[PDB]
């Protein structure tokens, strides 16, 4: 009855936000048009027309809710108006104003005489009756947000973090506060992250770690053993040094001050965000408002889902395979481009490419898994997607690094016996450089290669897809184009809005905390990323994408239990980065227990002569990066005291560095009040002083 | 004005709970009398008389609140009356009824013309104006609670846990639910705790662990080295076996199934109490309702407090000293009472005595610390006392065990060099039995000696102190003694009521979870304790002690963050009980890596010949429980491969057993819904179905 908000087609002013009569400002536009399958056109018309009829208090339909109709659902949900505030009304905003008219779009459904009870635009736009329902914005509130925040000129400026909630809402504001804070806490781990390896840069020469390695009369003698079986040469340690001279900054003590700092920093990063969310819990309001057959389907999906997890695990195996083949050519074919780091650059590019391809499969297959599973509407759907998409992106992004980490440079044996992966082909081995540069280049050109490549995808892929709406649809308009046609031609965002833009940071946060024993610059590269990503995600959210609905979330949600699970994992893996993949505990032990006269030939503590005095010679019956017995002895190619010393000091380091840092991350979490103390002085002035 | 509830002295019926007129039932009695310093008697009278005056709507004063006066504070606090319920009134109890008249005793203070504003009986009874304000009870509700619950005849009966809240309240009920549940979860760790060492009891003979030890032709040969310097003999391993034959049940695999079970059990114990408190969150209602100089004083108290902590640490040193002296006599002076276990029984009695003495100092000094510090009234006072009294009782009770645990049987050296505690006196050493029996006897006669001795203190010390009120005050009364005189003569409980009765269980829970690698019966002894302590604390709370005020607490409070800190500590210390103090990882390594031909002389896996093939011989320049090099070799009395193998497998076991169990205690805490599922089906019928 009387549905149609009549087709008074007049669009005289292009930058308009009002009706014909004025003084009425838009909150949201839906659109659908059916004049042109074959017999269901008016069926979708009668499926639509009863919804807008009780809503009352191409051609794109306006909405508006006046004083008597905005307030009658502002008594339903308890809105805080203004200073001080109170629930559900207090007399003294288009960030608030277009959530109430979406709260209006929450309760009211449709009335059928044949029992199809359809509610909201959840199924309305997905079945295909509507095409796009959206809000829109201004030209000002928007124009001053370009010059100060959302421009590449205003990168050095402070963030208008109030003027992000007041324009975009707590879905977006609590991302950009968490992007600005995590930019700030990266800075106090970048400047102390620069400083620690600057001492590693200053002390580059005089510790006999790359001092012996660059001396061809005594560090050129070290004729190693070829890794693969056929077509690999016996090589020396001249050719390592070009990598060994910058290896002296990646782990002398630069890590062991920083990795014991990052364990302190991440529990200072998380716990001061607990104080940061709590003072944004106050200044922004943030308050809440057959069965067996089905079970079997869900279990199959849960079980069916892991296999993909199994598949991603499998791809890395292909990289291991590809690496061996590609590595062999590398030596024959050829700025200090040694084949040890050529394969570590080239075949780490080829892996990173396949990470970006198989992300896009994961981008789609985890959706097709989840809707085939039984979700909730929109809140436990993404929360079932969170532990399913991220857990794909965990093992997509980090299982390559977790290969080059703990279990790549292991598994040698009796003739230099590889494990052979229980197949007829050989297995691979690390180079006697305490292989870390194969990791920290893989770490760099992922977390800096994702930082480059996704900031091309987040910049021009919304740009050229809007030019699909410009070079392919209409060009040369009436030169006064009305506002909603401009804003509709901007592409939408997806139902899950900032899921993809949190996930790409939790991937970055899982690089600056999981793998930071090695690469202390991983704050700095992620500092200059977050200096730009806070403008890139500013720009694409203001120019290109449509206006997100300003829904309210109190914390980030479902990534706070992940970072709290990443940080607990980060103490275990940083300690396993240091012991099992960093070659400094084999140096700490030599300095402290093999240059002393038991098993040693030197008076006081000195690192002179470390490299030949670690490895194991191998009769033809060359040296290699192992702690095994020399041939010709009582128990040859079984282990030494030295492995069993070092693997004990390896495993004691895991035990000491976890139990100290997990106590420090308990003391720091104890000795910090979780709600911030000035806000504890501010919330107590809101209940007794009213 | 008109204070005195007039002295109509008539006490005709002895078991009375009413007034002269009847139909009015008591809730609470205060008492004070001043007819007999020297000039302040009427000063305490005028300090009293204005309080009871506005309360209106030896001789012991009744209280009573009728319908119009009970309800007017039952609208202030939101009481749930009954089935289903609602806040602050709903029309369809002396557990509830005498909390409202204590809620009446919360707001109303006194009116002075000279500014002393005194509120309640907090300072009223502590300054000395009143002597005892208390409630009292019946003869029935009480009489059927004796026959079924609070009698040593009714020990096998099920607990009337509803009929503890409905008589005593959630202060007491949530203790007795937590005493009954922790009795039940001890039972499913007693029956699987009996079973695991019953296989240790069945396989007592055929593993060459006590098979060699009892064979004097080949296990009598092992002429060890005396521990202390003067007056200690060279001894053999005949004399160990009497302890080695029951040592074969304390740790073969009995622990490694149970200690990996107890890590699963305690996170099943805690997490099913989360479901147990939540279904008691529903069935019982449980809903809430100069500065610099001062800072310096608080800091000094905080710092001053540790020293006592330092002192308790110091006493153990005296035990170490006393043990050495007492041990020396033991050998000379003498049911298989070998001196290895005689000192472990006798000098572990003498330590347990001094634990009970220095508990009583800790019982008083932590009070004198806390009131000299700045508390809150009664809630952050005990919560500041919780982390101060228990942390004394932690290091009082467990630092003796943590001495006999990780750092007693260490620190030998070059001539068998003790550390000498940087003094001229010698240090002590363990016996080659993988010293654990010095712990599990210390563990038994503490946690079973406290269980005996405190259940004498909790039984007859309230009994004979009531007989101080019977044999020393009045005997042979009018033979119809009125009720409040009987109940006043029962001794009071203390301000902190069940603090002392939670703490003695958290001490027991810190014995069944911290030290359970060894002594799998520590559930069973604590099962038969909690079978009796749930009747002993039933009996003393019903017969001897006065009626506690039925205040409401939702959970136990301030011991749930302690057991959650005990259980996280329990995974670290059980693994350090197994590796550093249990001698099975030195057996696991021998079986798996020294009976194989590297460093071995036997074809397949066999434990034949373990004991001589572990220890280190010592030239006169005897064997002892060390993994050190034999004299006369390349690096003598420095370590072996074998220490460095075993200490690696020690430290890998800490790493494997923590990271598995902390993941299992993460999976079990994930795969269990914290609110119980039937209550999740029950709370959703209380908000939408009303
Ligand atoms: Ca971005
Ligand atoms: Ca007791």
Curated annotation (Swiss-Prot), chains A, B:
Consequence the record notes for mutating residue 355 to K/E: Induces a constitutive phospholipid scramblase activity
Protein name: Anoctamin-6
Notes on activation and inhibition: Exhibits synergistic gating by Ca(2+) and voltage. Inhibited by some non-specific cation channel blockers such as: ruthenium red, 2-aminoethyl diphenylborinate (2APB), gadolinium and cadmium ions.
Result when mutating residue 246 to A: No effect on lipid scramblase activity
Similarity comment: family membership: Belongs to the anoctamin family.
Residue ranges, Cytoplasmic side: 366-386, 457-498, 541-557
UniProt catalytic activity: a 1,2-diacyl-sn-glycero-3-phospho-L-serine(in) = a 1,2-diacyl-sn-glycero-3-phospho-L-serine(out); a beta-D-galactosyl-(1<->1')-N-acylsphing-4-enine(out) = a beta-D-galactosyl-(1<->1')-N-acylsphing-4-enine(in); a 1,2-diacyl-sn-glycero-3-phosphocholine(in) = a 1,2-diacyl-sn-glycero-3-phosphocholine(out)
Extracellular topological intervals: 199-252, 323-344, 408-436, 579-652
Effect of residue 397 to K/Q: Constitutive phospholipid scramblase activity at basal cytosolic calcium levels
Glycosites: 206, 238, 612, 619
Effect of residue 397 to A: Increased speed of phospholipid scrambling. Requires lower calcium levels for activation of scramblase and ion channel activity. Constitutive scramblase activity at basal cytosolic calcium levels
PANTHER family: ANOCTAMIN, ANOCTAMIN-6
Consequence recorded when altering residue 397 to S: No effect on lipid scramblase activity
Tissue: Predominant expression seen in epithelial tissues. Also found in skeletal system where it is primarily expressed in osteoblasts.
Pfam families in the cross-refs: Anoct_dimer, Anoctamin
GO cellular component: chloride channel complex; cholinergic synapse; plasma membrane; synaptic membrane
Quaternary structure and partners: Homodimer.
Positions contributing to Ca(2+) binding: 458, 501, 504
Variant or mutagenesis effect after changing residue 445 to K: Induces a constitutive phospholipid scramblase activity
Keywords, sorted A to Z: Calcium, Cell membrane, Chloride, Chloride channel, Disulfide bond, Glycoprotein, Ion channel, Ion transport, Lipid transport, Membrane, Metal-binding, Transmembrane, Transmembrane helix, Transport, Voltage-gated channel
Function: Small-conductance calcium-activated nonselective cation (SCAN) channel which acts as a regulator of phospholipid scrambling in platelets, osteoblasts and fetal thymocytes. Phospholipid scrambling results in surface exposure of phosphatidylserine which in platelets is essential to trigger the clotting system whereas in osteoblasts is essential for the deposition of hydroxyapatite during bone mineralization. Has calcium-dependent phospholipid scramblase activity; scrambles phosphatidylserine, phosphatidylcholine and galactosylceramide.
Higher taxonomy: Eukaryota, Metazoa, Chordata, Craniata, Vertebrata
Mutagenesis / variant outcome for changing residue 355 to A: Does not induce a constitutive phospholipid scramblase activity
Note: The term 'anoctamin' was coined because these channels are anion selective and are predicted to have eight (OCT) transmembrane segments. There is some dissatisfaction in the field with the Ano nomenclature because it is not certain that all the members of this family are anion channels or have the 8-transmembrane topology.
Biological process, per Gene Ontology: bleb assembly; blood coagulation; bone mineralization involved in bone maturation; calcium activated galactosylceramide scrambling; calcium activated phosphatidylcholine scrambling; calcium activated phosphatidylserine scrambling; calcium activated phospholipid scrambling; calcium ion transmembrane transport
Native source organism of the sequence: Mus musculus
Subcellular location as annotated: Cell membrane
Phenotype reported upon loss of the gene: Mice are viable and fertile, and display no major morphological defects. They exhibit deficiencies in Ca(2+)-dependent phospholipid scramblase activity in platelets and defects in blood coagulation. They also show reduced skeleton size and skeletal deformities.
